[PDB]
Amino acid sequence: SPEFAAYKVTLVTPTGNVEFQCPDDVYILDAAEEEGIDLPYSCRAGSCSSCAGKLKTGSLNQDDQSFLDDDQIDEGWVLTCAAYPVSDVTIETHKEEELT
Ligand code: FES
């Protein structure tokens, strides 16, 4: 497997869709911000609802998140501040209200 890689992230946001390359060692949130995208957050530590999204295709590593339970992870919930892509992914953002 490659020492380093980047994956195509498609974010489906309330103001439109955007795509960018995310390094496999950068969280979705941080990579979005580098591209000038404003995404919701507060704690940036994987322990709250602020940065919630829904995974629509592809795979994430969310080992660094703790607030979502195993059923919520199975349902496709994502804490964008604590998730790394391991494939190209599509995430629908700004989902805190739906999650909670
Ligand atoms: S901003 Fe709190 S879990 Fe992501």
Author numbering: -3 to 95, 101
Q: What does the primary publication say about this deposited structure?
A:
The noncanonical amino acid, para‐cyanophenylalanine (CNF), when incorporated into metalloproteins, functions as an infrared spectroscopic probe for the redox state of iron‐sulfur clusters, offering a strategy for determining electron occupancy in the electron transport chains of complex metalloenzymes. In conclusion, we have incorporated the noncanonical amino acid, CNF, into two FeS proteins, and in each case observed a small, reproducible shift (<2 cm−1) in the nitrile stretching band of CNF following cluster reduction and re‐oxidation, which is consistent with an electric field effect from proximity to the cluster(s) in different redox states. We also obtained high‐resolution crystal structures of CNF‐labeled proteins in both the oxidized and reduced states, demonstrating that site‐specific placement of CNF caused minimal structural perturbation, and giving a precise location for the CNF side chain in each protein. In the multicenter hydrogenase, DdHydAB, the nitrile group of CNF is 12 and 13 Å from the [4Fe–4S] proximal cluster and the [4Fe–4S]H subcluster of the H‐cluster, respectively; the fact that spectroscopic changes are observed at this distance confirm that this functional group has long‐range sensitivity to redox changes. These investigations lay the foundation for employing site‐specifically incorporated CNF to probe the redox state of FeS cluster‐containing proteins by IR spectroscopy.
